[PDB]
Amino acid sequence: AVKYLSQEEAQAVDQELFNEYQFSVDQLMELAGLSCATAIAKAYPPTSMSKSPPTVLVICGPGNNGGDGLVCARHLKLFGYQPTIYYPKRPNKPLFTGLVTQCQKMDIPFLGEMPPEPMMVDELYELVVDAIFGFSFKGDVREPFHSILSVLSGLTVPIASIDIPSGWDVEKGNPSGIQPDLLISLTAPKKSATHFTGRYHYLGGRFVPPALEKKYQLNLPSYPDTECVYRLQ
Amino acid sequence: AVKYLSQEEAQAVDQELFNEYQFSVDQLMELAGLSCATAIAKAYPPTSMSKSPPTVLVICGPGNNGGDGLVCARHLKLFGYQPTIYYPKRPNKPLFTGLVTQCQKMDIPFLGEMPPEPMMVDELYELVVDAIFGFSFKGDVREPFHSILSVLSGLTVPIASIDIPSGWDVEKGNPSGIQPDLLISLTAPKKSATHFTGRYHYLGGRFVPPALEKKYQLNLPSYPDTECVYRLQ
Ligand SMILES: [Cl-]
Ligand SMILES: [Cl-]
């Protein structure tokens, strides 16, 4: 059974990947966001949805989890979804400005503001992607993100969270925080995933070298055939 | 039916992708090599092979096609193959030195020399990946690559070529050149693919924005579900 990583373990594994293993961020971020779009398309196939193209709002935060979201949005569009992005706080780095341009060239619209009421979100988007905070955030949720999470917590439509539900303690979870219907753990699940309450938990990010898996005792499941996700039941 | 691109068209589309669209090379190279490993695993599944782990020799050339090969090798290992790489001429750029390190950390061995006889290649490797020359090469095949192609042309085991069979005119093919059993066209097929004589032609590189597909009249086939390849019949 797969290892659930502490924040310190997650950070160690990441340090190795981008340093000794010499993977680049945009490379693993590409594979991670592809896994996210893949898990979404598996859990909520366009046929299962009442809108042809199904609508999705992807909300991207100010760090790497936000980047995973941008890559996720672009693959969802290729997979037959109709994504909209809300990306209020963007790092001033070419990685992210390039990702945004890519989404714009995919004809994915960016919102200028978040709808202020859950009912409006419910009415416009069949699914909401939470790409707000990742496993490095240790907190004080400041604004614009506190009120965004407040709206998310009132939604009727499902939320899919990338890696960790935003606003959860990376190890401890958060009983009173958002409760995503889908979680995509990237690389290996974090300890907070033991508190996951939704229907779908997928592992994604099929790039972990066997040597790293062995060193950290990750005990990854076997991804089937050529798939980049695995459904954890 | 899909458009088969001229060299000039292929180069235009590439210029757009990496310039106006602001995709990065390592990003599309990741997706391209993943599609290659995926097509290989579909056409030659490990179960269909007489060796548990199936052995594969991936021969990487001095440009981007060589890079696609390196990414291909690493995903093949994750897919359950036992790759070996021969990479005689390597650009002095971090893109490629990083890819090599990644393959080394995947425990993929690099050969110091090419076996000089087809029989030896046949005996050691169940499949040979031709990642030697891509659609930018306009020629004189110099050495070490001329004698490598001479050995390849004598093989009994199948060759899978990335994008274009190395040594073929990118538009005209080459009746007397290598005859791969699998071709993975990347982005859109090139005119040389009309001369393809093998059993398996896959399209890969599922990243083409609809606007670019429209502008160049690519008429891409519909990739099924979340797959990153499509079998062209
Ligand atoms: Cl604040
Ligand atoms: Cl020479």
Side-chain angles (χ1 to χ4, degrees):
Chain A
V2 64
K3 191 175 190 172
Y4 287 64
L5 305 181
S6 71
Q7 204 174 49
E8 75 154 61
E9 273 159 358
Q11 297 180 328
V13 165
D14 263 39
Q15 200 276 347
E16 290 214 40
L17 285 165
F18 300 115
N19 292 282
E20 294 98 316
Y21 285 76
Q22 284 301 284
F23 290 105
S24 80
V25 174
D26 59 352
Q27 179 184 17
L28 301 191
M29 179 168 295
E30 195 58 31
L31 297 180
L34 169 61
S35 285
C36 290
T38 297
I40 289 167
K42 287 183 187 291
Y44 312 106
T47 57
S48 79
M49 312 280 260
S50 49
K51 277 172 171 161
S52 215
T55 57
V56 183
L57 170 66
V58 181
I59 303 168
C60 295
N64 293 324
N65 204 252
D68 295 337
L70 295 176
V71 169
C72 184
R74 151 165 63 74
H75 289 283
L76 282 178
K77 180 93 178 207
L78 288 170
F79 297 161
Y81 297 79
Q82 184 173 105
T84 289
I85 297 160
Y86 182 45
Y87 193 18
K89 307 282 182 144
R90 316 181 181 180
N92 188 23
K93 320 212 191 157
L95 172 59
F96 299 95
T97 60
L99 293 171
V100 167
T101 298
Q102 295 159 32
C103 295
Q104 298 182 283
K105 304 296 199 181
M106 292 294 297
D107 302 320
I108 301 163
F110 281 72
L111 296 170
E113 64 192 12
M114 174 85 195
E117 300 299 318
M119 206 187 64
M120 302 183 306
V121 180
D122 285 345
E123 290 279 330
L124 288 165
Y125 309 106
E126 292 181 278
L127 170 68
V128 171
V129 185
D130 157 30
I132 296 160
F133 298 133
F135 76 84
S136 84
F137 281 94
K138 285 203 250 188
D140 113 58
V141 178
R142 298 166 64 258
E143 298 280 19
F145 302 107
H146 174 82
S147 72
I148 292 170
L149 288 176
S150 178
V151 175
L152 264 47
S153 82
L155 297 177
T156 291
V157 296
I159 295 167
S161 292
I162 297 181
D163 211 17
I164 275 126
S166 302
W168 284 29
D169 189 283
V170 171
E171 304 192 12
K172 261 72 183 287
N174 183 6
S176 65
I178 66 174
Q179 302 301 311
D181 188 44
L182 163 63
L183 177 61
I184 309 97
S185 294
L186 297 173
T187 308
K190 265 65 55 184
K191 282 260 162 111
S192 55
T194 71
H195 301 269
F196 173 63
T197 57
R199 293 178 296 167
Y200 305 105
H201 186 195
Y202 283 82
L203 178 70
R206 180 169 193 187
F207 47 68
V208 179
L212 195 71
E213 172 174 8
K214 177 189 290 217
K215 171 166 183 197
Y216 288 90
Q217 303 164 345
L218 300 189
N219 278 91
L220 292 184
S222 302
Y223 288 85
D225 58 273
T226 58
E227 291 284 6
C228 68
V229 300
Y230 176 89
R231 183 141 164 224
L232 298 162
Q233 342 234 26
Chain B
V2 64
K3 191 175 190 172
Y4 287 64
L5 305 181
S6 71
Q7 204 174 49
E8 75 154 61
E9 273 159 358
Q11 297 180 328
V13 165
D14 263 39
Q15 200 276 347
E16 290 214 40
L17 285 165
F18 300 115
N19 292 282
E20 294 98 316
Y21 285 76
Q22 284 301 284
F23 290 105
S24 80
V25 174
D26 59 352
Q27 179 184 17
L28 301 191
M29 179 168 295
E30 195 58 31
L31 297 180
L34 169 61
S35 285
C36 290
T38 297
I40 289 167
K42 287 183 187 291
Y44 312 106
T47 57
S48 79
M49 312 280 260
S50 49
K51 277 172 171 161
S52 215
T55 57
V56 183
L57 170 66
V58 181
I59 303 168
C60 295
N64 293 324
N65 204 252
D68 295 337
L70 295 176
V71 169
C72 184
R74 151 165 63 74
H75 289 283
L76 282 178
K77 180 93 178 207
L78 288 170
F79 297 161
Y81 297 79
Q82 184 173 105
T84 289
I85 297 160
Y86 182 45
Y87 193 18
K89 307 282 182 144
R90 316 181 181 180
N92 188 23
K93 320 212 191 157
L95 172 59
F96 299 95
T97 60
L99 293 171
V100 167
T101 298
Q102 295 159 32
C103 295
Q104 298 182 283
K105 304 296 199 181
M106 292 294 297
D107 302 320
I108 301 163
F110 281 72
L111 296 170
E113 64 192 12
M114 174 85 195
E117 300 300 318
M119 206 187 64
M120 302 183 306
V121 180
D122 285 345
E123 290 279 330
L124 288 165
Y125 309 106
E126 292 181 278
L127 170 68
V128 171
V129 185
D130 157 30
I132 296 160
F133 298 133
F135 76 84
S136 84
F137 281 94
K138 285 203 250 188
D140 113 58
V141 178
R142 298 166 64 258
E143 298 280 19
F145 302 107
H146 174 82
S147 72
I148 292 170
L149 288 176
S150 178
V151 175
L152 264 47
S153 82
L155 297 177
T156 291
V157 296
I159 295 167
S161 292
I162 297 181
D163 211 17
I164 275 126
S166 302
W168 284 29
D169 189 283
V170 171
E171 304 192 12
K172 261 72 183 287
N174 183 6
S176 65
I178 66 174
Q179 302 301 311
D181 188 44
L182 163 63
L183 177 61
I184 309 97
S185 294
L186 297 173
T187 308
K190 265 65 55 184
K191 282 260 162 111
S192 55
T194 71
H195 301 269
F196 173 63
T197 57
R199 293 178 296 167
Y200 305 105
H201 186 195
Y202 283 82
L203 178 70
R206 180 169 193 187
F207 47 68
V208 179
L212 195 71
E213 172 174 8
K214 177 189 290 217
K215 171 166 183 197
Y216 288 90
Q217 303 164 345
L218 300 189
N219 278 91
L220 292 184
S222 302
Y223 288 85
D225 58 273
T226 58
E227 291 284 6
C228 68
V229 300
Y230 176 89
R231 183 141 164 224
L232 298 162
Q233 342 234 26

